[model samples]
Target: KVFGRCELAAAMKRHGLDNYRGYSLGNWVCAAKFESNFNTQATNRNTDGSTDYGILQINSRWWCNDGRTPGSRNLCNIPCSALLSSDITASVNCAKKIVSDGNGMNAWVAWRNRCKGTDVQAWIRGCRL
Candidate 1:
């Protein structure tokens, strides 16, 4: 499922991502925009041979266990398939765990390049929250 801009924001907000770890809803919105364009089924294979799954592109290397990435930690205790679910609850939960684990949003390169140190509020400005 491809979520609309505000639709994705509202979904994430319901999951408690708003202002999580000092990252505003805009930061998450911007990351999702560039990471997978809000498509729940998105997946990307990394140069290091790890796969990133779901809308937020959660990494297989250290996050979800895809049963393919060698030496994966599966810190989220979830299968990569769960990340692709349209519900987004699993994805959001794993994301919170990732940030709380101290990797921060910088764990997502898209966030670093597109959301960090920028006018992130613009991403969520028109949304009702």
Candidate 2:
């Protein structure tokens, strides 16, 4: 269940993320495309000594935790390891909370640099729900 493009799009549609927090679905999906390439196990460490978690790349410093990820605020109250699973439930809920908290898609640098003000529809153009 390492989700592909279409599956990921469908999940987002039902993940309680439809046009949430004043951000568009395309922004969310587009950000994910660049963040993890649709892979749930994705992670990347930042110079801030924080680790990113899951498809949306939630940061260890402010969001999820992975024990070894020091300085974790763990606002999601979830192990960053849980975000690596194929089950997107935890990741989506946590991400939703992140956006709800005024972070929006701004939490993802990838989104700010790449998905912003772009043709986000390209991320889900032909993907059927």
Candidate 3:
């Protein structure tokens, strides 16, 4: 597991996520925290044949292709492994696309359960990110 960092939070703004998909940077980033604790290389076997990818836990059943899962719709056209990169460029871009498909952060279940309707500023506290 990887720890959340101010730089990742800062990237939200630096990467134009301040108001991405009509959600605050803190909200999305906080969801990332609850999802995978900010582990860029995070991959979880849901055991039902779905894999949650990246810090965002982007699921292979929807966001990416894991090859092992038949009929897995890789809407992002990205390999699941790519989402495990530390750069997060591909992962962030794909995650942004997903939010447009749902109501704000609704695409991410953890966001609705925890990050949403909460003060997320502390997610990026300090480091001035």
Best lDDT goes to which candidate? 1
Q: How well is each residue in 29-95 modelled by candidate 2, as lDDT tens digits?
A: 8888889988898889888788887899888888877777665588888878998888888999998
- Backbone clash pairs for candidate 3 read none
Q: Tens digit of lDDT per residue, candidate 3, span 1-129?
A: 364577778766787787775677788678888888888877789887998888889898888888988878999999999988878788879978887885668878898899777898767667585
| lDDT (Cα atoms) of all candidates against the true structure | 0.92, 0.83, 0.81
RMSD of each: 1.0, 1.5, 1.7
TM-scores, one per candidate: 0.95, 0.90, 0.90
Count of backbone clashes, every candidate in sequence? 0, 1, 0
- Error in Å for residue 87 of model 2: 0.8
Over all chains combined, what TM-score does candidate 3 have?
0.90
| Candidate 1 local lDDT, 1-129, one digit each (tens) | 999999999999999999999888999999999999999999989999999999999999998898899887989999999999989999999999888886799888999988899998898888887
Q: Which candidate number maximizes TM-score?
A: 1
Arrange candidates by lDDT, highest first: which order?
1, 2, 3
Comparing 1 and 2 on lDDT, the stronger one: 1
Look at candidate 3 and tell me the lDDT of residue 69. 80
RMSD (Cα, Å) of model 1: 1.0
